[PDB]
C-alpha cells in the first residue's frame, strides 16, 4: 500500500484533488481547475439568463450547472465531465437509461463517482479492491467488490447520485 497517495486536508469536494487522485498522480493544478470552473459557470450563467435557441440549451440546462451552497458547491459536473471526456472517461448517471443500457456492473467498473447533497465522493478501481477518497477525507478508504456493489446499491436505493465513469485512464 506504498503506492496510494496519502494526504489529509481540510475542505469539501476538491476538483484538483479528485482529478489528481483519480489519475493516481498529480496531473492538474488547483488554480487552473478553479479558473476553468469559474469561466464555465459564468459563461453558462450569462448564456442561460440571456436564453438560447438550440439543443445546447437543453443539454446545458439538463446538466444542472452552477450550485447552491459553498464548501462543496464550488465546482460543477460540467468541469469534471469535461476533464474526463478529454481523457476518454465518460460519466453515466445510474438513474439514466445509459447506465442500464450497457448494463455496466459496479465491481466491473473502472472509475466511480458519488454525489451527495453538499458533498462529493471519488471512487477508483485498484486491482481487485476499490479505493475511495475525497477532499473531506483524510485518508484512502479500501473497499471490496462484494461490499462495493451493496455499498452503492444502498445509496441509489436511498436517495444519492451515483455516477459511472467508464473509459481509458492513464494509470
Curated annotation (Swiss-Prot):
Free-text tissue specificity from the UniProt record: Ubiquitous.
Catalytic site positions: 14, 119, 134
Modification(s) after translation: Monoubiquitinated N-terminally by UBE2W, possibly leading to activate the deubiquitinating enzyme activity.
Subcellular location: Nucleus matrix; Nucleus; Lysosome membrane
Domain Josephin residues, every copy: 1-171
Position(s), cross-link Peptide (Met-Gly) (interchain with G-Cter in ubiquitin): 1
Free-text comment on this protein's domains from its UniProt entry: The UIM domains bind ubiquitin and interact with various E3 ubiquitin-protein ligase, such as STUB1/CHIP. They are essential to limit the length of ubiquitin chains.
Disease: Spinocerebellar ataxia 3: Spinocerebellar ataxia is a clinically and genetically heterogeneous group of cerebellar disorders. Patients show progressive incoordination of gait and often poor coordination of hands, speech and eye movements, due to cerebellum degeneration with variable involvement of the brainstem and spinal cord.
Stated role: Deubiquitinating enzyme involved in protein homeostasis maintenance, transcription, cytoskeleton regulation, myogenesis and degradation of misfolded chaperone substrates. Binds long polyubiquitin chains and trims them, while it has weak or no activity against chains of 4 or less ubiquitins. Involved in degradation of misfolded chaperone substrates via its interaction with STUB1/CHIP: recruited to monoubiquitinated STUB1/CHIP, and restricts the length of ubiquitin chain attached to STUB1/CHIP substrates and preventing further chain extension.
Subunit structure: Interacts with STUB1/CHIP (when monoubiquitinated). Interacts with DNA repair proteins RAD23A and RAD23B. Interacts with BECN1 (via its poly-Gln domain). Interacts with PRKN, UBR2, VCP and tubulin. Short isoform 1 interacts with CASP7.
Protein name: Ataxin-3
Taxonomic source organism: Homo sapiens
Source organism phylogeny: Eukaryota, Metazoa, Chordata, Craniata, Vertebrata
Residue span relative to the full protein: 1 to 171 of 361
Amino acid at each position: 500500500m506504498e503506492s496510494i497517495f496519502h494526504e489529509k486536508q481540510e475542505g469539501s469536494l476538491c476538483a484538483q484533488h479528485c482529478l489528481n487522485n483519480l489519475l493516481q498522480g498529480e496531473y492538474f493544478s488547483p488554480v487552473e481547475l478553479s479558473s476553468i470552473a469559474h469561466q464555465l459557470d459564468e459563461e453558462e450563467r450569462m448564456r442561460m439568463a440571456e436564453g438560447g435557441v438550440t439543443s445546447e440549451d437543453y443539454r446545458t440546462f439538463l446538466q444542472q450547472p452552477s450550485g447552491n451552497m459553498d464548501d462543496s458547491g464550488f465546482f460543477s459536473i460540467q468541469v469534471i465531465s469535461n476533464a474526463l471526456k478529454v481523457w476518454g472517461l465518460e460519466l453515466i448517471l445510474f438513474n439514466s437509461p445509459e447506465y442500464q443500457r450497457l448494463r455496466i456492473d459496479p465491481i466491473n467498473e473502472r472509475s466511480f463517482i458519488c454525489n451527495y447533497k453538499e458533498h462529493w465522493f471519488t471512487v477508483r478501481k485498484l486491482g481487485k479492491q476499490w479505493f475511495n477518497l475525497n477532499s473531506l477525507l483524510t485518508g484512502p478508504e479500501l473497499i471490496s467488490d462484494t461490499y462495493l456493489a451493496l455499498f452503492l446499491a444502498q445509496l441509489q436505493q436511498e436517495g444519492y447520485s451515483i455516477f459511472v465513469v467508464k473509459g481509458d485512464l492513464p494509470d
